Amino acid sequence: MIFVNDVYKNFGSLEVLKGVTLKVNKGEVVVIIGPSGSGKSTLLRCINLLEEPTKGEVFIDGVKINNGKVNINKVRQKVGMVFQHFNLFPHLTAIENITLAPVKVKKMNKKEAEELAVDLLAKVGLLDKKDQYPIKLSGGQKQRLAIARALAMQPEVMLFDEPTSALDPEMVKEVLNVMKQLANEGMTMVVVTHEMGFAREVGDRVIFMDDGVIVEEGTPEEIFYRAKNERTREFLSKIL
């Protein structure tokens, strides 16, 4: 399903990814961790081509997508993405946020759109706020709404780029609960996070990245209790 193959990335002379490989099969929850500047978020953003690798290749469903011989909108149709700072559309109401892409991209019927939207609002527990504008949303409400919007395009994999890192602490766990619920329902997920509780509770795999490389990987228990590499132990000792 996802196959990032030996990719590298540069920004100027700054080397962020230095040869990385990642395989994700349907149903996995893969959680990527590491110190800042490890390359976590960049590798995450190669998956739906918000970055383009200087070398290496990105395959989605057996199809190379960074050869310029493929349509990227058709890719991102299947590959959802949730952002650290939400990136809600500020001029659109809650529903309208959710229904915009399905109506204009999938060409859905607008009231089939509005029923998809009202049951997603119910799902993440925002049905009381269908008509408000994002400014009158809390951080938790915002991130839950961004998730509803992402899901309305019905992807087969969801990418999460540090979705709780900009939330007040009293608000982290409602977003975490929604994501967990997605994991329990079998969604394929790649999550970059500072919240190890999530990797504990629903993670299938944990990738430890450091200085642009995957330095160690394994199951959550393997990594949190029995890490073999010395960089992993250093990082974990500082963050656990």
Binding site: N48, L50, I72, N73, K74, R76, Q77, V79, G80, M81, F83, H85, N87, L88, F89, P90, H91, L100, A101, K104, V105, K106, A146, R149, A150, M153
Partner: protein
């Protein structure tokens, strides 16, 4: 002789006539300059090498060159081709051209001022650049832009006083006209300046009020 402002009073219809003209020059120039600029902006967004070429060298040339020389190049520079355009259409064309450039990069700057994340969310939801642009990015750039357009009009008021040196009967020309009959420069100018000041204040605060009813 010496200072006397009450002498100036019954030239009131002149000052007023000047004021009005300053407005109808400014509106018109800015108006064309806006539309021109809009269209100029769209040229710079093409991925066609020649058009981006020429829209960007137009912009850089007009902004990096004095307004006065552009006015005179439209006016004086075009006589020798057996064309003599009126002072009015000359001033309008100069201002609308100049304003067209400054508007072109008001628009470009208003677009990259909407957070790049917005475009990212749009694309990540499967939308093409065109749709992201129509339904997401441009409605926000517009509310970046209108305040800068208002500010542009306000600057153009002051700038248009330069068509006087070409003999157009704007608010600054009125001092020449009045002095030819009073031998007085100081007073009618003080009055003219104070008129510019009051106009600038007025538009500055209906522009700030418009900004806190918009954004």
């Amino acid at each position: 002789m010496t200072v006397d402002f009450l002498s100036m009073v019954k030239y009131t219809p002149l000052f007023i006539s000047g004021l009005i003209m300053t407005l109808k020059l400014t509106f018109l120039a800015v108006t064309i300059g806006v539309l021109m600029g809009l269209f100029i902006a769209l040229m710079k967004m093409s991925s066609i090498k020649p058009i981006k070429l020429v829209a960007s060298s137009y912009i850089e040339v007009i902004r990096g060159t004095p307004l006065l020389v552009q006015l005179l190049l439209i006016y004086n520079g075009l006589m020798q081709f057996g064309m003599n355009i009126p002072a009015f259409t000359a001033g309008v064309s100069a201002l609308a051209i100049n304003s067209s450039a400054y508007v072109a990069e008001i628009i470009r700057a208003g677009i990259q001022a909407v957070d790049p994340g917005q475009n990212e969310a749009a694309r990540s939801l499967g939308m093409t650049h065109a749709m992201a642009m129509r339904y997401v990015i441009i409605p926000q750039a517009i509310k970046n832009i209108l305040p800068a357009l208002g500010n542009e009009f306000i600057v153009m008021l002051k700038e248009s006083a330069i068509v006087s040196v070409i003999g157009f009967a704007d608010l600054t020309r009125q001092a020449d006209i009045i002095q030819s009959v009073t031998y007085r420069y100081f007073e009618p100018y003080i009055i003219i300046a104070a008129i510019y000041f009051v106009m600038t204040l007025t538009f500055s605060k209906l522009l700030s009020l418009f900004e806190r009813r918009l954004r």
